Design a protein around this ligand. Structure first.
Ligand SMILES: CCn1c2ccc(CNC)cc2c2ccc(-c3cscn3)cc21
Ligand SMILES: [Zn+2]
Length: 197
């Protein structure tokens, strides 16, 4: 399959992501490394991702998430759930069981199987922040481990977040690496130490 672009693009509205500062304690379930541009999270746990813009986008703007493999020798392979997890009937009623990325708690989430690339994505309406908040947060879930045999099988992935107009045209783009693992705090600490070395 052809490879969706991962080029960072703020666009007319100044679109970019933001992440909480959750730390690296052994008990943490989701933590983001700015130095690695990498999110570490446990299986199927809530991953808050912030959306930031400098100016107000039009009604009908949407926000899409898609995963691709990071390594060039694997980027043409569709990222999907492994043969076990696609069959474990953990459906939320909306997400197809094959999809790695879900949006949590948004009844207007839509899930796409691309008719030409066969790639999976989940898209929601772009919404302004809640009254009293400075940004909008989407809660994502990753539904396989990076290590799952027959699926990602230890290959690193990226999530690409695109801001789109109502036709699906590109307005903005950002991305981050993801590792779905049992101990995100320890793994973030290890990889940041490896980077320092
Ligand atoms: C991207 C999320 N977001 C913000 C994040 C951050 C900010 C900046 N707050 C200091 C504003 C917005 C914002 C405004 C409007 C809309 C909107 C209108 S009609 C559809 N979507 C969305 C907004
Ligand atoms: Zn799996």
């Amino acid at each position: 399959s052809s490879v969706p672009s991962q080029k960072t693009y703020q666009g007319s509205y100044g679109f970019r992501l933001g992440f909480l500062h959750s730390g690296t304690a052994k008990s943490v379930t989701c933590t983001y490394s700015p130095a690695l541009n990498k999110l570490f999270c446990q299986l199927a746990k809530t991953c808050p991702v912030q959306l930031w813009v400098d100016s107000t986008p039009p009604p009908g703007t949407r926000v899409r998430a898609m995963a691709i493999y990071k390594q060039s020798q694997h980027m043409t392979e569709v990222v999907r759930r492994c043969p076990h997890h696609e069959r474990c009937s953990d459906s939320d009623g909306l997400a197809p069981p094959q999809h790695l990325i879900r949006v949590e708690g948004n009844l207007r989430a839509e899930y796409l199987d691309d008719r030409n690339t066969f790639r999976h994505s989940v898209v929601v309406p772009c919404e302004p922040p809640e009254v009293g908040s400075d940004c909008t947060t989407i809660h994502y879930n990753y539904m396989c481990y990076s290590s799952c045999m027959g699926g990602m099988n230890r290959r690193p992935i990226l999530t690409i977040i695109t801001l789109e107009d109502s036709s699906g045209n590109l307005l903005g783009r950002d991305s981050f690496e993801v590792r779905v693992c049992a101990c995100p705090g320890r793994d973030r600490r290890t990889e940041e130490e490896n980077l320092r070395k």
